[PDB]
Amino acid sequence: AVETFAFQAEIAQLMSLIINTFYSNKEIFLRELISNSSDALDKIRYESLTDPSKLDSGKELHINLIPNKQDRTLTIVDTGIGMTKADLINNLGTIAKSGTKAFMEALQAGADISMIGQFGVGFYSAYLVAEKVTVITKHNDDEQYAWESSAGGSFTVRTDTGEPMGRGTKVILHLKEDQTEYLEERRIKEIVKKHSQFIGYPITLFVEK
Ligand SMILES: O=c1[nH]nc(-c2cc(Br)c(O)cc2O)n1-c1ccccc1F
């Protein structure tokens, strides 16, 4: 069973702004997704400090970057706290209506799209480079769910029958045809070194055969 939801009008407007605005500095999407993974890893670590059983679903706290040139996908995997179905539906765990309002006021006053993370809606920067995004997630308190959207005002949620993850989130970016530089090892290494140098978890860039 696949459930289709409409985005809140303000989030659909955020997504169209990201897709339509001429903005060359698209590489910041990766910093934003790694930042969200770091935050999710911090959340499960914090819960584990008082309840070690929180890590029964996996003790390793890490981030993997998996490019696949055949599928034209870049996957960002983390073993953080994950998201429940309600978190996915509620804008992937954000207060995105108020974040979008603040971001749009900042843009009108001179900010630029790279500042999106300061408004707590950095996930949507994925649409600078992806035509479709799939988010697979597993939280200790819920089942494994797949969220997906190609923008256009809607998203889907379903229970995922695919490869079980113990706990965490996988963001699969189905890249736009002209954004394949983000599958190149040297380009990803450059972006991680430039923008993600103070992330306190191992970031492993996988290589391809
Ligand atoms: O909580 C939680 N869990 N999980 C999650 C996620 C998401 C996303 Br979109 C991404 O990319 C990743 C991840 O990991 N989370 C969150 C949300 C928001 C913000 C922050 C944070 F951490």
Q: Tell me the C-alpha to C-alpha distance, in Å, between residue 132 and each of 1, 172, 199.
A: 20, 8, 26
First to last CA, the chain: 36
Strands 63-68 and 203-205: parallel
* Domain range annotation of the chain: 1-209
Give nearest CA residue, ligand 1 atom 15: 40
Q: Of the candidates 74, 80, 88, 104, which has an alpha carbon nearest to the alpha carbon of residue 166?
A: 80
Distance CA 26, CA 48 (A): 35
Alpha carbon of 35 to ligand 1 centroid (Å)? 9
- Provide the b/e sequence for 107-134 (b: ≥16 CB within 10 Å): beeebebbebbebbbbbbbbbbbbebbb
Method by which the coordinates were obtained: X-ray
Distance CA 74, CA 94 (A): 23
Strands 203-205 and 168-175: unpaired
- Provide the b/e sequence for 153-162 (b: ≥16 CB within 10 Å): eebebeebee
Alpha carbon of 194 to ligand 1 centroid (Å)? 22
DSSP code per residue over 14-71: HHHHHHHS--S-TTHHHHHHHHHHHHHHHHHHHHHTT-GGGGTT-----EEEEEETTT
Q: Phi, psi (5° rounding) for residue 2?
A: -110, 125
DSSP code per residue over 85-131: HHHHHTTTTS-HHHHHHHHHHHHHTT--GGGGGGGT-GGGGGGGTEE
For 40, the token pair is 């999710």
Q: Binding residue per annotation — 132?
A: no
Give nearest CA residue, ligand 1 atom 11: 33
For 161, the token pair is 């029958």
CATH class of 1-209: alpha beta
Residues 133, 193, 23: CA angle, nearest 5 degrees: 50
Q: Phi, psi (5° rounding) for residue 191?
A: -70, -40
The side-by-side arrangement of strands in the sheet containing 168-175 is: 3-6, 154-159, 145-149, 130-138, 168-175, 73-78, 63-68, 203-205
Q: Of the candidates 177, 204, 194, 201, which has an alpha carbon nearest to the alpha carbon of residue 114?
A: 194
Tell me, in Å, the resolution of the deposited structure.
1.2
Give the single-character DSSP code of 195.
H
Burial (Cβ within 10 Å: 0-12, 13-18, ≥19) of residue 148: middle
